[PDB]
Write a protein that binds this ligand. Structure first.
Ligand SMILES: OC[C@H]1O[C@H](O[C@H]2[C@H](O)[C@@H](O)[C@H](OCCCCCC3CCCCC3)O[C@@H]2CO)[C@H](O)[C@@H](O)[C@@H]1O
Ligand SMILES: [Cl-]
Ligand SMILES: [Cl-]
Ligand SMILES: [Cl-]
Ligand SMILES: [Cl-]
Ligand code: NA
Lengths: 529, 499, 497
């Protein structure tokens, strides 16, 4: 027994048997997407469309409904009795230091978005207005954006994060996105076909998710070069893709990820601390209460905005906006949960939440307040930043209108890169981890096999943005349910938790004990007469 | 014969008969008292129905979150007689009914076509968010109070299953049997009379305007809107005089089918995707606009919405206060041994779920019809709009015949479940009501339905509403004061003292 | 017996100057008011806005959570206690802006909203007079009352900062500075409040057919009269003076409102209770989020003379109010004290505005306006005269107006003397009458500095006076936390599992 016991400890830990049926079926869709997008660029882009108008139009309500559920659900679980439960066992304290913890996850699950949409999204919602609302409305412009980037999207991570972190550290299963479904699917099913199907959908959803954030990032680095210092031909779209395609493959191997994302303060924060002072410092402050206040005010209105909203005239806006962000963050969750779990060893199910929602929310707030704020201010001063309307161009158009803009258009260029890099190395490691049966430390070649093959989709979704968008949206549609159902696994798992049962056992006990106590003191007081 | 309090049955009868006589005999000097009182009630007591309507929702929710939420309806540490899933399935049954049939298509659409006060017209959200506001939290918060009350007094303590006993903490022991004890249980009865009879009329009128639309009867003549009732009035008796057990589940299961069937029909045939969109739209909006709706009044809209109210909000509120005695019993019965916290959340969410999807489907499909050039409005006659909706969909010719029947079945399960509850408050809290009393009440109640329905004449629903409003008005304070009894009663509970 | 000179003298140099400067250099004086006003507003407005809400959430978090159970002790009847404090914290408020505010927000609308909009005219008026302000009273009083009754330090506002500044700190230059700002803030606030009051009472005589002239020889009478009248009460201390007045003050309060409630648009006023509350909850966050950047930039000026002024004003009032709230709240639990400064004062503000603002709107609606020439200090009486028997009740309103101020003045004065003697609870009458008159004569300064410069200086000078004190009120928000966590009843509970 002793010889077969410890032999399996070093067995699964060393296990590098790359699942041939988890990797290949993914390599298939990936390279098939590349070729069906290189060789076929006429019917492929039609797939993106017809599919989108099917996903968005027939499942949009599901993103809309459950998107707001995932928020509440996890807000409950957090303030729930399951809160005190420690991810792993009570023999484990926080793995990394808190500040390094919250910083490693917020800088890992954060698409280049804040760069890309930070300046645009608010300035757009302000110029063109959003459905069911007037125009040039600061409140709605801010509240809406906030709504896209704070609690709503980040509770998605929390769910998958807690679902894996528990299924792994607390129970002891392998770090598969499918093992988190054991409470429902069973020990057998997670090793059956579904287990893979999920670990597949997870990988494919991860790919399109990263490739999108890659394409957008590329377009903006390129547009960042076009306006700052120019490449009409796709030499740099494929060249700057390489610069990054190789950059994050570095950390996937190496800690390098523990340090790369760590420096996003000298870069990102600097940019913000810069724009804060230089620009409309006061106006920005005015948008802090204006963002939180208005965000809280209009919250449910947004969760209710569907296709019938605005007298049925919003189906489009959603697809271009909200519904895209939902599906897009979803495609990221499979691997952002994987990562979030790891650094959350020993984190209570509660503290894990607040560090996943509140911190990233507070930043997303103070970020869109600066750039999206300053932008809307210039738009007001008649000193527009809009330009041609190309989001990729706007970011810098704003920076440049500020004393010391060129120097920051370079910083924000690299920052745009690193923002992707630090959140693409974690992707790869996970791409392979699932490629090798929850192999915590995947062979550095298999992860690099994905990270690069994932950028082979970026060069496709960008050379053949409504493709980087649509394809991503479609690639996440099924995995949506992988989060919706996951929201059930996490419950029928906790509810089967030892320490919780030991609590719910000593709970029933007392109602009986107390009952006896009061019933025999109702006789003492009744027999008294 | 028996000892069933005459002092509660005679004062109840006289007022029902007086209304049937003063409704039939003086069918012109009755409509006056109707609009005359309705004007006093809505003007002078509108702020009340409004202010307290929302109060009840706070009160109830505070009582679940409160440390009282752990207490369970019955002896200490008692447990449910049914499984939490069978429990739910019974409230689901309580959800669907005539009100949903009648106002399921009309109400939303109306708030679209016309828009509500303080808001623009053709507003999909607001049209739903308002509907929700009428049929979800607010209405059930009321029932949940009365229910919670009757369930505590009966199971936790051991008082008779009566509303008077619910007031013991305040009125005193001698009070439940005294004048108030009878008064309260009288108002409760007449409340249930016009409360149900209201539901009955809608059916009889809808069924009627459904025959003239199904091309069976020439027009909903004042002779047509009679044959409808009387036969369903005979249908009632048969289910009561041979054991009322057929109404609670033998018809419930029939309704659970026809209804679920019908809803699914429009759901799949009609704009399935739109209907779905109106799930987060209904809920999402209904949360955004909750308090703005809780603060709407005659002053609202620059002082120009006190009428919109008396025809909707104030009416419904009065229709809920009135039905609260009946629903309180039903709930109280199928909820013994359930914790208060678990009780409320079930009585608020399960039903809310039913209404949400239901309106989301019907109204939803109506609103989408409006949006896309194809209106079902017709003559604005809410009675016929359900069918109009139906006939606009393929096979909507047979579904219009089915709805005709589910109305009958409902007309029973409503006049049937009510007859028992009505008979119960007549016999000192007797659980199993007499086979003659219930059967008698149901018919009496229906007699009022016919009365209000015929007394108004052309679009008589006014009376139905007005009178219902006038019947509930006193019992609105009953419920309000019922909040106070519940609190002291609970603060005196042995477990909150044990803790 | 040994009044802290370093907290008094340095606190007098500032008020003994705002006079000579406001009287000697009349021009450059207001050129500072109008200047500072803009600096504070344009640059700190965001704060009053932001943290203003922090005060509501934080205080509600505390009261309902753990610490709420803590007692404020190791004295006064309860129903007298509420009036004691309500009267002490509430001044000219309901009387000066009780008719004009809803009526103004209605006619003109409010930044980012249509006009003739009842719901918002209430939501906005209610926003200013219910929770947000009274949370500013709960905090200061709390930090003090606790630092004193639960810990043992003196009632000096400074000592409530002990948990952060140190037992040595509240004795250092800050603890004094804190009790220095505490004094001055308390003074301007009552001066501004006195200016408005007397000013309104003056106009109360104009259309009263008693004194047509807004003559100084008249307002001065009313001013000094108020002074001497409340000096009687301040010196008469709690039991005999203050406690007796605050009840009488409430008595008139009802009598008036009751009158206006029956005589005026009864049902409409009732209709407004739900409408006032509902809308208030709905538009709450939107209002907490309304900033100078709201309404596309246009919201700047409005906030300047409405919201921000209010917050800033209530802050110049937190020192004495909150500090007095504490003294009369020994034994009162943390939950009983926080729900004692909010619920009832917020629930009394509500009924008030629904009866007055409601009638004022209800009038606007029937064409029978009561706006006149748009002079706040007149509309109250315009409202009354329109109601049968309003002539006599008009006089009651004038008196009650004096009362409202009086009950707030005495508490101020006494509390001031407490800050003048290292926390002497019941200081020498002569000192509580010294500040009572000292602060009083300041009222004349801002009133006799110019016509519009009354409103100009009373408003602005007050704002500045409570500009730094704002941080003081946000600092207590920390010192109070630590002072709480490290409490016996709490230390004995943290031991779980
Ligand atoms: O539904 C109609 C009801 O009113 C009728 O009388 C009404 C009718 O308008 C009308 O029948 C009556 O005057 C009509 C004169 C010719 C009818 C014969 C009358 C002779 C005197 C007694 C009443 C009937 O005046 C009454 C005014 O209310 C009759 O009483 C009945 O038909 C019924 O009660
Ligand atoms: Cl705004
Ligand atoms: Cl119990
Ligand atoms: Cl809408
Ligand atoms: Cl309104
Ligand atoms: Na006062």
């Amino acid at each position: 027994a002793d010889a077969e016991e410890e032999i399996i400890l070093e067995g699964e830990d060393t296990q590098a048997s790359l699942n041939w049926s988890v990797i290949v079926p993914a390599l298939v869709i990936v390279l098939a997407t590349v070729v069906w997008g290189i060789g076929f660029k006429d019917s492929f882009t039609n797939f993106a469309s017809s599919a989108l108008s099917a996903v968005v139009d027939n499942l949009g309500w599901a993103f809309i409904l459950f998107g707001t559920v995932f928020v509440f659900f996890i807000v409950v679980i957090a303030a729930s009795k399951f809160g005190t439960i420690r991810l792993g066992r009570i023999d484990e304290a926080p793995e990394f230091r808190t500040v390094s913890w919250i910083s490693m996850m917020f800088a890992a699950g954060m698409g280049i978005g804040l760069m890309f949409y930070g300046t645009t999204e608010p300035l757009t919602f302000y110029r063109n207005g959003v459905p069911g609302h007037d125009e040039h409305n600061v409140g709605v412009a801010m509240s809406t954006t906030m709504f896209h980037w704070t609690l709503h999207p980040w509770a998605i991570y929390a769910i998958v994060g807690l679902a894996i972190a528990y299924s792994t550290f607390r129970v002891g299963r392998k770090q598969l996105l499918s093992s988190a479904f054991v409470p429902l699917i069973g020990e057998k099913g997670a090793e059956g076909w579904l287990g893979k199907l999920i670990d597949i959908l997870a990988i494919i959803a991860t790919v399109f998710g990263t490739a999108c954030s890659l394409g957008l990032g590329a377009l903006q680095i390129g547009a960042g070069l076009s306006a700052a210092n120019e490449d009409p031909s796709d030499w740099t779209i494929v060249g700057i893709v390489s610069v990054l395609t190789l950059a994050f493959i570095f950390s996937a191997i190496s800690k390098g990820i523990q340090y790369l994302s760590n420096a996003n303060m000298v870069l990102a924060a600097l940019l913000a601390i810069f724009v804060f002072v230089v620009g409309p410092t006061v106006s920005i402050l005015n948008l802090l209460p204006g963002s939180i206040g208005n965000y809280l005010s209009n919250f449910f209105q947004m969760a209710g905005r569907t296709a019938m909203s605005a007298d049925g005239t919003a189906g489009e806006w959603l697809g271009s906006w909200t519904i895209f962000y939902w599906a897009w963050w979803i495609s990221w969750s499979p691997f952002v949960g994987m990562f979030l779990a790891r650094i959350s060893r020993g984190r209570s199910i509660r503290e894990f939440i607040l560090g996943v929602l509140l911190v990233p929310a507070g930043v997303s707030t103070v970020w869109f307040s600066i750039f999206g704020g300053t932008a809307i201010v210039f738009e007001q001063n008649g000193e527009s930043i809009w330009g041609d309307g190309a989001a990729e161009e706007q970011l810098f158009g704003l920076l440049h209108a500020l004393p010391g803009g060129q120097i920051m258009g370079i910083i924000a260029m690299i920052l745009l890169g690193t923002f992707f890099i630090t959140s693409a190395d974690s992707a790869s490691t996970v791409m392979g981890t699932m490629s090798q049966h929850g192999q915590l430390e995947a062979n550095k070649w298999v992860t690099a096999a994905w990270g690069v093959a994932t950028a082979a989709i970026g060069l496709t979704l960008l050379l053949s943005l409504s493709n980087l968008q649509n394809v991503t949206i479609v690639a996440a549609t099924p995995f949506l349910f992988v989060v919706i159902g996951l929201m059930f696994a996490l419950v029928k798992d906790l509810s089967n938790d030892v320490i919780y049962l030991e609590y719910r056992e000593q709970q029933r006990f007392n109602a009986r004990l107390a009952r006896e106590r009061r019933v025999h003191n109702e006789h003492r007081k009744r027999e008294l007469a």
